[PDB]
């Protein structure tokens, strides 16, 4: 009896918590509180090599797996919360965010309230690299 409030229209909310960046991509479904977790998934658990972890393909596969494990419990709707590395890094999303999100919708998960969440430090510590940066 997983959410036994049976009305066939009482949508059950969760949140997704996408953390996208370079070299990785995470999809971490939780409840309204973020304290209880449901099938955290990545991009590295699907592909073989290490230089194709952060591809939209591995992102798409992850959401399809998550959506499967999520519809097996009565969770129907979601709220989306997006994140970049932040701190003193790029603080722009990576190339796995677009692909993952779209694959949830077209799989069917009745989403609302997509928003961003990212640190944005006011004037925090000194960044790595050393005054001339990486001189490739």
């Amino acid at each position: 009896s997983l959410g036994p409030q049976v009305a066939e229209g009482e949508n059950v909310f969760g949140v997704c918590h996408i953390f996208a960046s370079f070299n990785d991509t995470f999809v971490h479904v939780t409840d309204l509180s973020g304290k209880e977790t449901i099938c955290r998934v990545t991009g590295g658990m699907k592909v073989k090599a290490d230089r194709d972890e952060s591809s939209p393909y591995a992102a798409m596969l992850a959401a399809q797996d998550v959506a499967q494990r999520c519809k097996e419990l009565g969770i129907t709707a979601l709220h989306i919360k997006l994140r970049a590395t932040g701190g003193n890094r790029t603080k722009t999303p990576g190339p796995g965010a677009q692909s993952a999100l779209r694959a949830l919708a077209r799989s069917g998960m009745k989403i609302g309230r997509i928003e961003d969440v990212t640190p944005i430090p006011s004037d925090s510590t000194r960044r790595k690299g050393g005054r001339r940066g990486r001189r490739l």
Partner: protein, 61 residues
């Protein structure tokens, strides 16, 4: 999840040598839904494809 699609218009060549080409397509089962894809070989407006990865949403190469 094998699919079909007809072609609407050709955009431009691409690739390191001008062998692939950009196109726009509708899926022959719903008319509103649409994507753009890379193909190889002589392709004209008025054609039909056998798509396997139903969604890629490719860009400039």
């Amino acid at each position: 999840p094998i699919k079909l699609a007809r072609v609407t218009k050709v955009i431009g060549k691409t690739g390191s040598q001008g062998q692939c080409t950009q196109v726009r397509v509708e899926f022959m089962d719903d008319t509103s839904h649409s994507t753009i894809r890379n193909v190889k070989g002589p392709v004209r407006e008025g054609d039909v494809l056998t798509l396997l990865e139903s969604e890629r949403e490719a860009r400039r190469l």
